[PDB]
Design an enzyme around this catalytic site. Sequence first.
Site, PDB file in Angstrom:
ATOM      1  N   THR D 174       0.836  -1.193   0.000  1.00 54.76           N
ATOM      2  CA  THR D 174       0.000   0.000   0.000  1.00 54.76           C
ATOM      3  C   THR D 174       0.875   1.248   0.000  1.00 54.76           C
ATOM      4  O   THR D 174       1.798   1.365   0.810  1.00 54.76           O
ATOM      5  CB  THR D 174      -0.909   0.035   1.231  1.00 54.76           C
ATOM      6  N   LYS D 176       2.031   4.833   0.984  1.00 49.49           N
ATOM      7  CA  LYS D 176       1.953   5.596   2.238  1.00 49.49           C
ATOM      8  C   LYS D 176       2.652   6.937   2.043  1.00 49.49           C
ATOM      9  O   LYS D 176       3.591   7.019   1.255  1.00 49.49           O
ATOM     10  CB  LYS D 176       2.608   4.837   3.404  1.00 49.49           C
ATOM     11  N   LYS D 202      -0.803  -0.604  -4.313  1.00 50.26           N
ATOM     12  CA  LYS D 202      -2.234  -0.327  -4.240  1.00 50.26           C
ATOM     13  C   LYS D 202      -2.520   1.028  -3.613  1.00 50.26           C
ATOM     14  O   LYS D 202      -1.745   1.518  -2.785  1.00 50.26           O
ATOM     15  CB  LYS D 202      -2.971  -1.428  -3.460  1.00 50.26           C
ATOM     16  N   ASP D 204      -4.415   3.173  -0.949  1.00 50.23           N
ATOM     17  CA  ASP D 204      -4.994   2.892   0.356  1.00 50.23           C
ATOM     18  C   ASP D 204      -6.519   2.879   0.253  1.00 50.23           C
ATOM     19  O   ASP D 204      -7.115   3.474  -0.653  1.00 50.23           O
ATOM     20  CB  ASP D 204      -4.537   3.924   1.386  1.00 50.23           C
ATOM     21  N   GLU D 205      -7.161   2.185   1.196  1.00 48.64           N
ATOM     22  CA  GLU D 205      -8.609   2.026   1.095  1.00 48.64           C
ATOM     23  C   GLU D 205      -9.332   3.370   1.104  1.00 48.64           C
ATOM     24  O   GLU D 205     -10.403   3.495   0.499  1.00 48.64           O
ATOM     25  CB  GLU D 205      -9.126   1.128   2.222  1.00 48.64           C
ATOM     26  N   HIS D 294     -10.844  -4.827  -0.748  1.00 50.09           N
ATOM     27  CA  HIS D 294     -10.427  -4.435   0.591  1.00 50.09           C
ATOM     28  C   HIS D 294     -11.637  -4.549   1.514  1.00 50.09           C
ATOM     29  O   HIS D 294     -12.749  -4.161   1.144  1.00 50.09           O
ATOM     30  CB  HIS D 294      -9.881  -3.002   0.576  1.00 50.09           C
ATOM     31  N   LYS D 334      -0.190  -6.522  12.333  1.00 50.56           N
ATOM     32  CA  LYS D 334      -0.774  -5.586  13.289  1.00 50.56           C
ATOM     33  C   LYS D 334      -2.273  -5.773  13.497  1.00 50.56           C
ATOM     34  O   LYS D 334      -2.823  -5.192  14.441  1.00 50.56           O
ATOM     35  CB  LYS D 334      -0.493  -4.136  12.859  1.00 50.56           C
ATOM     36  N   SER D 379      -1.985  -8.632   4.692  1.00 49.03           N
ATOM     37  CA  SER D 379      -1.554  -7.243   4.697  1.00 49.03           C
ATOM     38  C   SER D 379      -1.660  -6.661   6.098  1.00 49.03           C
ATOM     39  O   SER D 379      -2.596  -6.970   6.838  1.00 49.03           O
ATOM     40  CB  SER D 379      -2.407  -6.416   3.724  1.00 49.03           C
TER      41      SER D 379
HETATM   42  O1  LIG Z   1      -4.221   0.749   5.744  1.00 49.41           O
HETATM   43  C1  LIG Z   1      -3.568  -0.247   6.158  1.00 49.41           C
HETATM   44  O2  LIG Z   1      -3.072  -0.302   7.308  1.00 49.41           O
HETATM   45  C2  LIG Z   1      -3.024  -1.188   5.118  1.00 49.41           C
HETATM   46  O3  LIG Z   1      -2.814  -0.424   3.908  1.00 49.41           O
HETATM   47  C3  LIG Z   1      -1.710  -1.822   5.577  1.00 49.41           C
HETATM   48  O4  LIG Z   1      -0.614  -0.890   5.590  1.00 49.41           O
HETATM   49  P1  LIG Z   1       0.845  -1.453   6.011  1.00 49.41           P
HETATM   50  O5  LIG Z   1       1.205  -2.513   4.984  1.00 49.41           O
HETATM   51  O6  LIG Z   1       1.735  -0.225   6.007  1.00 49.41           O
HETATM   52  O7  LIG Z   1       0.644  -2.021   7.395  1.00 49.41           O
HETATM   53  C4  LIG Z   1      -4.066  -2.276   4.844  1.00 49.41           C
HETATM   54  O8  LIG Z   1      -5.237  -1.627   4.338  1.00 49.41           O
HETATM   55  C5  LIG Z   1      -4.434  -3.075   6.094  1.00 49.41           C
HETATM   56  O9  LIG Z   1      -3.506  -4.153   6.234  1.00 49.41           O
HETATM   57  C6  LIG Z   1      -5.816  -3.712   5.980  1.00 49.41           C
HETATM   58  O10 LIG Z   1      -5.971  -4.715   6.996  1.00 49.41           O
HETATM   59  P2  LIG Z   1      -6.591  -6.172   6.675  1.00 49.41           P
HETATM   60  O11 LIG Z   1      -5.717  -6.768   5.584  1.00 49.41           O
HETATM   61  O12 LIG Z   1      -6.516  -6.913   7.984  1.00 49.41           O
HETATM   62  O13 LIG Z   1      -7.985  -5.861   6.213  1.00 49.41           O
HETATM   63 MG   LIG Z   2      -4.858   0.426   3.745  1.00 50.22          MG
END
Ligand SMILES: O=C(O)[C@@](O)(COP(=O)(O)O)[C@H](O)[C@H](O)COP(=O)(O)O
Ligand SMILES: [Mg+2]
Lengths: 122, 242, 482, 480, 123, 139
Positions: D174, D176, D202, D204-205, D294, D334, D379
């Site tokens: 993702t 950042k 990708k 971010d959501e 997502h 995490k 992720s």
């Molecule tokens: O926004 C976030 O934190 C991430 O972009 C991770 O960033 P990092 O790779 O920097 O941690 C993903 O969307 C989460 O992992 C979603 O969780 P899940 O896969 O459990 O839905």
């Molecule tokens: Mg994300």
Amino acid sequence: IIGNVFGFKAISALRLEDMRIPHSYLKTFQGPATGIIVERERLNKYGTPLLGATVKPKLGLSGKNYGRVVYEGLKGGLDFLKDDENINSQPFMRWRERFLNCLEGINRAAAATGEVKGSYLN
Amino acid sequence: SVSERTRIKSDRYESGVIPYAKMGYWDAAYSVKDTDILALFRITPQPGVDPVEAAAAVAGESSTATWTVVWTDLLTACERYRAKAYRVDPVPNSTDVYFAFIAYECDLFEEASLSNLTASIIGNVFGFKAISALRLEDMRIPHSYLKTFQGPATGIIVERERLNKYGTPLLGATVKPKLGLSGKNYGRVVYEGLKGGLDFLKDDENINSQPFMRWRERFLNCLEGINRAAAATGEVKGSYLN
Amino acid sequence: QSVSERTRIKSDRYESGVIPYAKMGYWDAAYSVKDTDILALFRITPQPGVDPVEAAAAVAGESSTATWTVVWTDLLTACERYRAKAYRVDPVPNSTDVYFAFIAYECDLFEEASLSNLTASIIGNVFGFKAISALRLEDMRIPHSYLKTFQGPATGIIVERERLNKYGTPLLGATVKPKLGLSGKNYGRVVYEGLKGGLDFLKDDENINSQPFMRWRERFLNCLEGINRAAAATGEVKGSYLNITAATMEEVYKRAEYAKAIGSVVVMIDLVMGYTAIQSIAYWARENDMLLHLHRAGNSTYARQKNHGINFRVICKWMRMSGVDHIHAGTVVGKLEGDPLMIKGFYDILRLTELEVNLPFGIFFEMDWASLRRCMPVASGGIHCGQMHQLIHYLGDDVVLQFGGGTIGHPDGIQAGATANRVALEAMVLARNEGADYFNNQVGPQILRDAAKTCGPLQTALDLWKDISFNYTSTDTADFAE
Amino acid sequence: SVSERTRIKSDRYESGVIPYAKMGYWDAAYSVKDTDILALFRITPQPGVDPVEAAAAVAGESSTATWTVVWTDLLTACERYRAKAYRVDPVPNSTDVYFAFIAYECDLFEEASLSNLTASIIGNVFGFKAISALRLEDMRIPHSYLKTFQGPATGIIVERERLNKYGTPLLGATVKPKLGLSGKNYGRVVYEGLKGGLDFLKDDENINSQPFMRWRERFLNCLEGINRAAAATGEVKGSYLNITAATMEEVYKRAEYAKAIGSVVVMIDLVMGYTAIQSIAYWARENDMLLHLHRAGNSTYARQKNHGINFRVICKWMRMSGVDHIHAGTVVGKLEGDPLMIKGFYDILRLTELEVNLPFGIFFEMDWASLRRCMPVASGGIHCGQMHQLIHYLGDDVVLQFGGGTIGHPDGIQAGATANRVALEAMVLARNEGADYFNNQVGPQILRDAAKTCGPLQTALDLWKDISFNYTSTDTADFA
Amino acid sequence: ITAATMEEVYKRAEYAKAIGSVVVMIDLVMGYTAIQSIAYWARENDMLLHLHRAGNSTYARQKNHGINFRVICKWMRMSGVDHIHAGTVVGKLEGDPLMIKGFYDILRLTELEVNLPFGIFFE
Amino acid sequence: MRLTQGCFSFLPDLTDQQIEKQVACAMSRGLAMNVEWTDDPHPRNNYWELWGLPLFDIKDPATVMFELNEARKSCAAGYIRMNAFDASYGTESCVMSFITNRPANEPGFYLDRTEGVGRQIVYSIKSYSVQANPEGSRY
Ligand SMILES: O=C(O)[C@@](O)(COP(=O)(O)O)[C@H](O)[C@H](O)COP(=O)(O)O
Ligand SMILES: [Mg+2]
Ligand SMILES: O=C(O)[C@@](O)(COP(=O)(O)O)[C@H](O)[C@H](O)COP(=O)(O)O
Ligand SMILES: [Mg+2]
Ligand SMILES: [Mg+2]
Ligand SMILES: [Mg+2]
């Protein structure tokens, strides 16, 4: 004709007073969609000025009360009413509410008088 | 009769003409809201007209008022919708000209519609007999109303990123003569100017589509000139196609 | 040595590695909230040993701009502006290691008019973070500036009553029963009988869409015959919530356009359709002069428990922003969960032009509704006409009271069930307006018995369901008294 | 009167209230049909409520019943349509919580409609006063109902064929910071990450379209970054362009734009909801597009053991709807993820059929009816020092995504991507050679060995080797 | 509404709907793809769909070779026509009563039991 | 049949004492009352005829009851309704409307059915009283 010359430094003031648009240029334009003559034929009204009124207050009325004013004014004798120029679509009245209620008021006044009636929907 | 019995008899809503400043459109104590639209007008009242009454007239006829009292006000939250002139100052170094501040409720205006904003603020008040001259000098458009609008499609930052040009003003030129050129010669001027260093050229404001040059002819020839200059320089180039 | 090594960031904040969220800029006890900020109140239960401020800063960070380790690309942005700030953390009263955390989000973080974008940040990932054992979103302050980008209700309470020509009492409704199995012809029969007997509306059950026992066009056409028959029999505007819930947006639009083409006053959708379809159809309803009823199917999967999920009062805000005209919001006294302080709070959020802080009712933020239209609450589920004094007291004037089993289960038929409910409603409103202490158990029930003396259907309904109650301990309860 | 004379007087259909268990919604002898939809609920009754009556209430109010008897039942084949609770067991190590099995007739449900299935199964029963907590734990979707659904637009097999990538997990990251970057800088990060070795990056959501970056600017700049990295490496590359938007019309516009410019993949957020998800899953198949899901907002109902929807059910619904990827957990990152539950989710997404496996939360045998396989995505808070654990827990067909774990590398984004890819390939090579790589004596040494000739990996190990996220899980198994 | 092309079939179907007909009819010679298309259309446009089985007897007549009409019954009920011609026993067209009764059961019942004298070989 | 427009039409015809109590309730909330008449009972007949202006500045319920009874003396046979209007921001609408007078015999309505496309019916609700006689001599 008005694009840039009104901002020219060398001229402290400038007013366009009149224009002669030639016959050949005019023929490229439509002119009025209906025009005075066909308008009076659509309304079946000949012999006097037409009569109208802007709904008041300018802003704030609901669509339902807008149609009430339109109904009352047309029934009382007006040919038309009209939306105020700043009545478009707003939190106190969205436009479809005004249009449908006004059509009820228009048709009610037409059936009450035997006349063609209308209201300028903005 | 019932209509006589039910006539309104209050000071504010009995039928007849009263001054705008007594109809709710003047309030020296008004507390401006962060959501209000504010307008600053330069007002020149006709001789003998009270400057506060002139300001209240502008506020009234650009919001909810007309020239005589109407009972239909009472079918609305009328106090909310009235605009308020709230400050009238003399213009410096002037005789009988005033700056008037007027506040407008957020809900008066259709979201994202410049046509509606202007229909109120400039619609009729500039033709009012009682005012010999009127100028709109400034407006405070509140954050909440601005968010309903798009703002610039691209904007300065993304524009420079699309052109890959940063550090100097951009450069342009209008093709001349204003009128008369053919599409082929229009493309030639554009090619020469871009190749010589300009970022842009442009159609003149009155160059649309005309007997001496129809617009598709201009557009295709200019695209040849643009791409030729881009290949000759290694730069992004363009021309404002009208 | 190498250029990458020479140009490594060496500062405390942006050298590579992991540091606490509360040291990354996401905690600020001195933060001055802006009137354009989006504010969120979370109930946070940190894992043992997690500092409560660090947990709040982790929520702020991972719902705005942060990740788990420092990234230099922050420096390519106006990073301080975009960081959300946890700015207040209070212990929850009468609790061990649960906290209320207030978090402010910059206006520019959010796509205009997009509930999907708002929820992507606010609820997207933080509810799954290991370091927090439970998380609940309790309230939000949506600022005036963001609210103006949304439509709000397609119709709203005021225009709805004007379209129906009905003012003075709650509106009346009923879900057709059995939930599943009836034919389109028999669906229309029930709708005809219920409307003719006095109801303003009936409705498809939430799980009635299109099925082998009844395909949707058969239901729609037969209901329109029943509706127009009842309107001609009574002189009233009548309707039934035609359920347009479907698998795809194309099919939903097909069912909505069909409802419009045959003249339905109203359609309904289910919340399981999801926020993007809901906003689409809310715009459609405004553009097509259609009332839009929202059934909240699935809401209780996340809204039931106090420790975790989303409080329904936040769903109320999001759905009023999206622009539904009705939403189910509880009964207090029926078969589904509803603490009265919580319910009264929901109804205020749906109906008022502005909110004042009112902690017993769960209103944690003052909030202007920016003249978005009012959303009609719907009280439905296990209620009956013997409860009318309670319904009027808790729920007020602008509500749809829906009696499904409470209409169709009447021994003397569906028309009689509808008549009983309408007589009870009108008698109770009449007595309220006369000054009766109608919520009192010594007064309200007597008002109903008085009306029953001249209404056989009402007497029969009172006899049948008089002793029916659903008195259970609540899960979604207040934290403050008054 | 005729109304009085024709009142129904039978035990079952005389007016009034009777228990759901007496209305036909409880049958301990019910013979489950191979076409039935089965649901397993974890039910916590209110004090004084009979556990069988609570299960009958759930069955009744999620099928045909309401709170009082209605004669209109007799206008239908009423016994066919009633759902039956047919088994109620105590939950192990609990006195007041129960597992309740409920069977639903095939004909209750609109074909191919997740909205209709969920309208019944989760519509109202979670708010029922008489039950203090309720959780949907598993479902048996029968072969006949599954065939009405598309399943994944592409699926794992065709996805690897489109990417020409076989033999290791896929790799992603993702971008950042989550919010604030411009479209031009977004494309820079994508270019660097892909060039350094990642298969994907990708959005971010919560990156949709915002004042700091409008979505078309992101899409065009990312396509330049993608095609640059493809030409620099000779590999197919992509980035999950987020098409999540307020309305279906805007979602389609963003999807059509991504197709028009040649993206291999788009992503959507679960908050958009089931109807938009099914629409775009059909679109993705028709337009040759990989569809990444997502799961934004899932944990609001999926986190707690006592109440909500277990994510394994969401897995089934989303594989039915037809997304190509879904986030499904990491175990060691995490976000919450008990290993038994996670392995269960991954099996549900990837296998052709399921056998009962209670420690993994698999309560029903279920054939997947040849619906395509859905790619799980791991992720959130993971780093390349965990590669042996990721390979062990999550297997071969998964996308491992390192956002902070790539972009947080001190020597730049390319170095971060390279560290992750060398770690991955070295671990898989050693696994295939027979190394006992999950053992703490072996896995970490495989990584240290690869790092002796890969500066980026050595630096990554030095920085993050000791990072862990160790907390008590909320979503845990009931069987050992 | 039988016609040469699908475009012309839809034109005639839409015309029938526009003037308020309760029913349209199609011929089996139009073929399976047109039949399925118009069966979906009929549901979407509130129209009864009558299927005439023109040409069926070219392959359904003889015991030694072809397709028994009872299989056509299944395929056409699957496709979604509302009516299909299925025989009279006593009229001018071929129809042994055991075979005919089997066809009618296939078209009308919710389930089939093995019934060899009726030609029902499968449950 | 009984026209069941209005909010109290499932109760017996209200007495003047009952009407005055509803008026007092509305006026105690600051609402404006008005009285309207019609002899077209159609459910879409939005605009009944006004009896004067709304009584915005009236404080005494007896004055409203006076106008109601003057309307009853003057209007032709038909319907009279009493409305209460709330001009407050967020409402700006009627909040109560009930029938005070109805004809001794209301024939009601029939449902006119036009054959639409497919199976659709184009419906028109027709009033027996209105189709038979002009305004002012329908009842
Ligand atoms: O926004 C976030 O934190 C991430 O972009 C991770 O960033 P990092 O790779 O920097 O941690 C993903 O969307 C989460 O992992 C979603 O969780 P899940 O896969 O459990 O839905
Ligand atoms: Mg994300
Ligand atoms: O299916 C049902 O049970 C209902 O039709 C009620 O039927 P009865 O009127 O027969 O009880 C409603 O959908 C629920 O009230 C929804 O609950 P809520 O309003 O709390 O979302
Ligand atoms: Mg005007
Ligand atoms: Mg120029
Ligand atoms: Mg229901």
